[PDB]
Design a protein around this nucleic acid. Structure first.
Length: 904
DNA sequence: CCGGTATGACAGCCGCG
DNA sequence: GCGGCTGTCATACCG
């Protein structure tokens, strides 16, 4: 097997590596690595090393890393450039592994653990770690076992041993519903005192030292609590043993608001699943607690207990231990579904970085490019501490707030990556500049042609058409690998079809699955002697065909993620290949591309419909245009179509045959006008919107920029049997909007587009009467709690104090003295409720932590004073007028027509 | 260490017989 | 004060 790294660290003049060797064993080694940095040299001096600009460089080899970094410092103090990879870990990875890394996850120790800490005085702060750790459940991926460490005696109670018999029983049989899947995998270890527990867990830690450390909030709680607990009882030297290299660092992470501290454990890659979820899930959640995310992903019911957390070990220790195990297991079930760990491994090895760096698009691309350039014997440029200034961005069209019956959308393919390739945008390819005219003049093509020899962007940038740019080449590569892994996935899909027919007529003798590649599809030379084989062997040849089929998509997804993350990296000042003018070029071209095609789509549709000057494109956002298909329908009449599906077919056929080539011809003209290297503005039909045929619905409406709703029938050649609502930017798609309200507004939107005015009025009328019977959680708004102390003046709302903050300061007055009550942590989101005049609180709102039921100390009175009428107006009625006034509909039986004009 | 533009809510300011 | 208008802040969205 091929050798691969696990963790990599720099300590002083030696790098510390953990790795799997040629025999599958986990090994560690200190290396006094000899790095190589690069300086500018005269022409006459010959080497094979050149920078990205094609300028000669001399490889300067250092004895140790101290000397290397001391030299960079000296180059700064005078005004010269120090070329090469300054991050010596990365340069080491590339040297030890100068080939395509193929990893085996089975050999990688992935640990996820969760601790329990009984704390009667509120949340147990990890910095102090003053309370005994009374439970640790530690799962090891290699062992496939759960290791349970259970404290039996503490200041907070003497408890009996946890029973694995009871833990298996049904909820109505004695509690604890630990699944059969993991019951055989639990290893239970009770302890007489805390010192024995921590010491045994630290010995356990030495034996099964995690390479990847995961869990929920593990970096902000579990790690720093365990480390500080051991440090305070035993000492720093004992606590530092959590690092296999015996080195730890206390790191202070600071946001734009607030500050906290984490512990770095050199020799361990920490992938907190909360951070892993937040980055890769691509959906904002009202709460980021484990129980809420588990509910979302796994559909698993509420993990319920009796009383508060701080009294659960004392009252039901059996349930206390079981809920610590399930908590670990939930993170395991989520990973089984989303694969965010395998993905972060697959991306990390591909780029040849340390796995924690995949949280940073910067570090990843910095290494992928570094790897390719290293083969070319090319030298990477120096990082320059560029200042921060926001460059211009995407174009968004202002839409007329109206109803729109029929809409066809058209989206461009990977717009920004495509722009980079089309114009050849890269640091070294910057050819020159030209005097620019207003963007409009380029959109309308009246301004003189920018250049006869160079590839151009509307911001005044010129790029060589003959050079192959470092950035564009590298993104073409990833684009090609994505394209190549279709030739592996679909190739297995061709082979997966003739298995059910192969097993339909088999002949058994000897199980002989001959070695033939699944990535490259089978030919008639192999297909002839593969169907007459054994019946039992066909199952294994299908099992490995499915293995390759998923593996093809797994790598394919990682390429798209890499594609989509490039632009953001190029726009980041801390990026090695960052250039202000280049990022401006990517974006301004996009501004042109969208408006250019808008101008072309209108001109084309005017010619075919006979009219002149009418606006067919209603809305355009970044890479997508929206076209009103009203006149196209009216051209053949609505009553001529039999069913809904018959007019969806018509617009689909029209887009395909008539509109696509018009779009295609328009962009080719733009490529020539700009003198670009390659035409890559491919725009294909996205969505087809409209009401049911013979119905009083409106089909779609806009209220403003980034706020619209459509009734979709087809999305890229896929016909929905039942129509889907594509709501974008409206309240129903916002995390702030209450749950019951969220669904009721969506239903109002559904009744608008599909059923008409009369139906909307009927639903709204009744949702008034039974509004008060709905759950109080489903009618509370959600907001992030930031800068609470900034507006806090002795527990009182200060100058310019927000509404959600005003609720937290009413909450603090309500929990006055009670250290048992749940706390509002800054950064964490909170539920918001309004309460009427005459309330026994002070202000007019109250806010409690999100994802939880409000405490019994105030639920007695809050569920009594909360103003529904104000809540009905603020969260439901006001947003509804937003929709209805824009759609030209009325939600209420009789409204005056005059109450729409601004008047005197 | 991946620009654009919406709504809610507050506070300054101007003219308000 | 009572609305209107506008700058600001905070939050959360669209690509």
């Amino acid at each position: 097997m091929k050798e691969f790294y696990l963790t990599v660290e720099q300590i002083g003049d030696s790098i510390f590596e953990r790795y799997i060797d040629s025999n599958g064993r986990e090994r560690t080694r200190e290396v006094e690595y000899k790095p190589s940095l690069f300086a500018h040299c005269p022409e006459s001096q010959a080497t094979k090393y050149f920078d990205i600009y094609g300028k000669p460089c001399t490889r300067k080899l250092f004895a140790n890393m101290r000397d290397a970094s001391q030299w960079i410092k000296r180059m700064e103090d005078i005004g010269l450039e120090a070329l090469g990879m300054d991050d010596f870990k990365l340069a080491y990875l590339s040297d030890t592994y100068n080939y395509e890394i193929k990893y085996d996850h089975t050999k990688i120790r992935v640990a996820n653990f969760d601790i329990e800490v009984t704390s009667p005085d509120g949340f147990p702060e990890p910095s102090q770690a003053k309370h005994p750790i009374d439970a640790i459940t530690h799962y090891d991926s290699i062992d496939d076992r759960f290791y349970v460490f259970d404290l039996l005696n503490s200041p907070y109670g003497n408890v009996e041993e946890w029973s694995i018999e009871i833990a298996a029983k049904l909820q109505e049989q004695g509690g604890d519903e630990v699944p059969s899947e993991i019951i055989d995998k639990i290893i239970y270890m009770p302890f007489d005192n805390e010192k024995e527990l921590l010491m045994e867990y630290l010995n356990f830690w030495q034996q099964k030292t995690p390479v990847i450390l995961t869990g929920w909030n593990v970096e902000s709680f579990a790690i720093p609590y365990v480390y500080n607990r051991i440090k305070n009882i035993f000492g720093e030297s004992t606590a530092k043993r959590l690092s296999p290299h015996r080195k730890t660092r206390v790191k202070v992470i600071e946001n734009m608001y607030g500050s906290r501290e984490i512990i770095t454990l050199f020799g361990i890659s920490v992938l907190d699943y909360i951070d892993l979820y937040k980055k890769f899930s691509f959906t904002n959640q009202p709460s980021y607690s484990l129980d809420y995310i588990s509910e979302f992903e796994l559909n698993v019911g509420k993990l319920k207990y009796d009383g508060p957390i701080s009294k659960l070990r004392e009252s039901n220790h059996q349930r206390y231990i079981s809920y610590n195990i399930i908590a670990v297991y939930r993170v395991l079930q989520i990973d089984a579904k989303r694969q965010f760990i395998n993905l972060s491994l697959d991306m990390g090895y591909y780029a040849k970085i340390q796995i924690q760096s995949v949280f940073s698009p910067i570090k990843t691309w910095d290494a992928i490019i570094f790897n390719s350039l290293k083969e070319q014997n090319k030298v990477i440029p120096q990082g320059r501490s560029h200042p921060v200034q926001p460059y211009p961005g995407a174009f968004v069209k202002e839409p007329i707030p109206n109803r729109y019956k029929y809409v066809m959308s058209f989206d461009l393919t990977s717009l920004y990556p495509s722009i980079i390739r089309q114009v050849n945008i890269s640091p070294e390819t910057i050819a020159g500049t030209f005097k620019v005219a207003p963007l409009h003049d380029y959109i309308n093509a009246v301004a003189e042609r920018p250049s006869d020899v160079y590839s151009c962007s509307p911001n005044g940038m010129m790029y060589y058409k003959d050079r192959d740019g470092v950035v564009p080449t590298e993104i073409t590569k990833v684009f090609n690998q994505r394209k190549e892994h279709k030739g592996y996935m679909l190739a297995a899909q061709r082979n997966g079809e003739i298995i059910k027919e192969a097993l339909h007529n088999p002949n058994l003798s000897v199980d002989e699955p001959l070695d033939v590649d699944y990535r490259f599809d089978f030919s008639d030379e192999i297909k002839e002697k593969i169907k007459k084989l054994s019946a039992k062997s066909l199952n294994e040849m299908l099992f490995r065909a499915q293995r390759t089929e998923v593996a093809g998509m797994t790598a394919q997804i990682n390429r798209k993620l890499l594609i989509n993350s490039l632009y953001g990296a190029l726009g980041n000042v801390w990026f090695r290949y960052y250039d202000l003018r280049n990022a401006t070029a990517i974006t301004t071209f996009g501004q042109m591309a969208l408006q250019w095609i808008e101008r072309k789509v209108n001109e084309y549709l005017n010619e075919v419909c006979g009219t002149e000057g009418e606006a067919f494109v209603l809305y355009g956002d970044t890479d997508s245009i929206y076209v009103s298909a009203d006149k196209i329908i009216d051209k053949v009449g609505e009553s001529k179509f039999r069913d809904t599906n018959h007019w969806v077919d018509f617009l689909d056929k029209f887009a395909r045959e008539r509109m696509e080539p018009a779009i295609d011809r328009g962009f080719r003209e733009m490529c020539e006008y700009m003198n670009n290297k390659q035409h890559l503005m491919f725009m294909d039909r996205e969505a087809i919107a409209g009401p049911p045929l013979g119905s009083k619905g409106i089909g779609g409406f806009w209220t403003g920029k980034k706020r619209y709703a459509l009734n979709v029938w087809d999305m890229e050649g896929t016909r929905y049997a039942e129509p889907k609502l594509k709501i974008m930017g409206l309240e129903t798609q916002k995390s702030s909007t209450p749950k019951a309200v969220q669904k009721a507004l969506k239903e109002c939107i559904r009744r608008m587009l599909q059923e008409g005015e009369e139906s909307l009025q009927e639903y709204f009328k009744e949702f008034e009467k039974e509004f008060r019977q709905l759950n109080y959680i489903s009618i509370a708004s959600v907001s992030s709690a930031n800068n609470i102390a900034k507006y806090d003046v002795g527990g009182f709302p200060g100058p310019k104090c927000p509404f959600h903050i005003r609720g937290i300061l009413t909450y603090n007055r309500a929990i006055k003295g009670n250290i048992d009550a749940p706390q509002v942590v800054e950064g964490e989101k909170v539920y918001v409720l309004p309460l009427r005049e005459g309330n026994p609180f002070g202000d007019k709102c109250i806010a409690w932590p999100s994802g939880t039921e409000i405490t019994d100390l105030i639920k007695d009175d809050v569920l009594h004073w909360m103003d529904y009428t104000v809540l009905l107006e603020k969260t439901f009625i006001k947003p509804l007028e937003g929709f209805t006034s824009a759609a030209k509909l009325d939600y209420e039986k009789k409204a005056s027509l005059f109450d729409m004009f601004d008047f005197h």
